[PDB]
Structures are given as C-alpha cells and as structure tokens.
C-alpha cells in the first residue's frame, strides 16, 4: 500500500489489513484447533 | 532490507542511512537473521515465554 494516507484508506487497505492481520489470527486459530482436536499438547508451532 | 539488489527508491538512500552508523540488510542477511530464530536454543526460548 503506497500513497494511501488516512483519507485514502479504502477497499485495497481494508483487504491488505485482512491478509496481514485478521487472517493471520485466523490461520493461527486453525492450527490451534487442529492440534487440540488431536490432543497435541507437546508440539507447539513457532509463529515467526 | 535492500530488495533484489537493483536500483530502488529505497536502495539509493541505503548507503546514506548507513553513514549514520546504522545497518541495512541484504535479503540473505535478513533470512539468516530469521533462520537464526529456528535454532534449537531460541525454539526452546519461545516455549518458555
């Protein structure tokens, strides 16, 4: 996102924010759910 | 992190930023830095806190 100040924030930025935050939380949540579903308490995934 | 090592609007001022006593990184350098966080020692550190 370049040349997008406060007053320019619209569809691209709201989508970019989905990729780069909301769906990273979702991604982490999914592998949490999959591990717990199989009782995997002792193989944490390191998130860089 | 200087891109593909070609002429960027960011790369052309990197040498200038370094004149401040500050370090910019090749992608290989930054990859090494990051792969350094998957060493057994810091993997175990992440598990503590």
């Amino acid at each position: 996102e370049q040349g997008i100040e406060l007053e320019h924030i619209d569809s691209k930025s709201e989508f970019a924010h989905r990729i780069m935050l909301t769906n990273i939380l979702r991604m982490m949540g999914c592998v949490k759910k999959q591990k717990s579903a199989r009782g995997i308490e002792t193989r944490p995934a390191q998130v860089i | 992190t200087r891109g593909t090592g070609l002429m960027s609007a960011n790369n052309i001022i990197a040498e200038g930023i370094e004149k401040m006593g500050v370090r910019t990184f090749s992608q290989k350098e930054m990859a090494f830095n990051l792969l350094g966080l998957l060493t057994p020692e810091v993997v175990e550190l992440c598990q503590k806190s």
């Binding site: 308490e41 002792t42 944490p44 | 057994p40």
Partner: protein
C-alpha cells in the same frame, strides 16, 4: 445364598492380543471404563501416549513430542527410566532409551506390522483387557 462350584481363574499370556480387544466391554461397563481410563490417563500424563489409541487403531509408528513445559516433564520420565543394579556394594544406573537426552525434541516407537504386538505395549494392553 449358595456358593458357585469350586472355581479357578487362569489369565492369558502374550500372543493372544488382537486390535480392538476389550473395547466392546469399554462401551458397556462402568467398571471396565474406569480401569482403561485410569491407565490411559497414567500413560498420557507420564509417557505422552494413549494405550487406548494403540489398542483401538494399532498404529505402525508412534512418535512422542517433548515440546513445552509439559513435554520436558514427559522427557524426564523417559530419561529417569533406569536399571537399578547394586555392584561392589554401591548402586549403578543404566538408561533405557539411550537416544533420549536434554536435546531430544521427540522419540519414535517403530514396528513392522503394528505397535500392539511390540511387547512394551502388548503387556499393558493385555493386562488391562483382563483386569477390566
């Protein structure tokens, strides 16, 4: 109240074990559930595997992971598994699980055809089927 005719109970050895054994009883009997569960909880909490899972699904390979504070406690229990011999008056110590050290992230049990017939799992599995 009348005694049953004179009875002797005989308990079967290794070689008889079968995938899914004792699990019909596990569904229907409170008494059996409590036996299998007490045991399953013991194995999961101290050695990081389920004796029920092994009896039910008879996996070919099973790998124990030593991640996080729960995983290191389990790894200690694998390392603390020793031979208590008494030679020349003094005690000496020998590690079952030579591979598992302070730097081990996992240990894997293997078997050609299924872990249920590797004696270390076979014995508890058979014992429980019978005790239940």
């Amino acid at each position: 109240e009348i005694e049953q005719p004179v009875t002797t109970f005989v308990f079967t050895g290794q070689g008889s074990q079968e995938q899914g054994m004792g699990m019909d009883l596990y569904k229907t009997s409170k008494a059996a559930q409590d036996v299998w569960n007490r045991a399953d909880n013991h194995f999961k909490d101290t050695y990081g595997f389920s004796i029920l899972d092994i009896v039910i699904n008879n996996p070919v390979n099973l790998t124990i992971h030593f991640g996080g504070e729960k995983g290191k406690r389990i790894r200690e229990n694998y390392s603390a598994m020793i031979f208590e011999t008494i030679v020349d008056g003094k005690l000496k110590t020998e590690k079952i699980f030579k591979e598992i050290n302070e730097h081990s992230t996992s240990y894997t049990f293997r078997s050609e055809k299924g872990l249920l017939s590797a004696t270390q799992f076979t014995q508890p599995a058979l014992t429980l089927m019978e005790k239940a």
